[PDB]
Amino acid sequence: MNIFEMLRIDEGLRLKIYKDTEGYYTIGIGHLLTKSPSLNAAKSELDKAIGRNTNGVITKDEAEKLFNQDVDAAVRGILRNAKLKPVYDSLDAVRRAAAINMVFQMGETGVAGFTNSLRMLQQKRWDEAAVNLAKSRWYNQTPNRAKRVITTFRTGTWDAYKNL
C-alpha cells in the first residue's frame, strides 16, 4: 500500500466526466474539473488539463498522468503551508499518506477537519486526534472514506485499506 493505491481506492477511476460527492464535475481518479454547474465549463477545463480537444472522455494513461500531478500538487500544498508543513514533517510515512489524502482535492470540510487535528497529530495523541477529526464536517459527509483516513492517522498502519 502507498498514497497512490490508497487514493485509487478512495476515489475510484472513471474515464468519462462524472460528478463527485459534492456534485462537482470531475474525471479520472478524483480530478476535480470545476465547481461550475456548466458541463461546457467542465469540458473546457478537461481539454486544458489534458492538452487536447477531448469528448469528455480520457484514456487510463491520461487519468493516471493527471493523478500523479494531483498527488504532487497535494504534497506541494502541504510543504508550502505554514500550518501543514510542521505537522507533515512530524509524521511517519504512513500517516503522511493520510495527510496527503485529506488535502487531496477535498471540500472545505476536509481541510477544516484535518486542520483541527493538526495539533493533536503533532503531539502524537492519536486517539484524541481521531476523535477530533471524527466529529468534523468531513466525517459527516463521508463516514466511510473519513473512517479509513482517521484509522490510518490513529494506527499508523494500512489496516483500513488491506481488505480493499
Curated annotation (Swiss-Prot):
Changing E11Q: Complete loss of activity. Changing D20C: Nearly no effet on specific enzymatic activity. Induction: Expressed late in the viral replication. The keyword Glycoprotein does not apply. Substrate binds at L32, F104, S117, N132. Keywords: Antimicrobial, Bacteriolytic enzyme, Cytolysis, Glycosidase, Host cell lysis by virus, Host cytoplasm, Hydrolase, Viral release from host cell. It is found in: Host cytoplasm. Transmembrane segments: none annotated. Changing G30F: Almost complete loss of enzymatic activity. The enzyme is destabilized by 1.5 kcal/mol. One of its GO terms (molecular function) is lysozyme activity. Its EC number is 3.2.1.17. It catalyses: Hydrolysis of (1->4)-beta-linkages between N-acetylmuramic acid and N-acetyl-D-glucosamine residues in a peptidoglycan and between N-acetyl-D-glucosamine residues in chitodextrins. Disulfide bonds: none annotated. Changing G30A: Almost complete loss of enzymatic activity. GO terms for cellular component: host cell cytoplasm. The active site is at E11, D20. Changing S117V: 50-fold decrease in enzymatic activity. InterPro entries: Endolysin_T4_type, Glyco_hydro_24, Lysozyme-like_dom_sf, Lysozyme_dom_sf, Phage_lysozyme-like, T4-type_lysozyme. GO terms for biological process: cell wall macromolecule catabolic process; defense response to bacterium; peptidoglycan catabolic process; viral release from host cell by cytolysis. Changing E11 to A/F/H/M/N: Complete loss of enzymatic activity. Optimum pH is 7.3. Belongs to the glycosyl hydrolase 24 family. Endolysin with lysozyme activity that degrades host peptidoglycans and participates with the holin and spanin proteins in the sequential events which lead to the programmed host cell lysis releasing the mature viral particles. Once the holin has permeabilized the host cell membrane, the endolysin can reach the periplasm and break down the peptidoglycan layer. PANTHER family: T4-TYPE LYSOZYME 1-RELATED (PTHR37406:SF1). This is Endolysin.
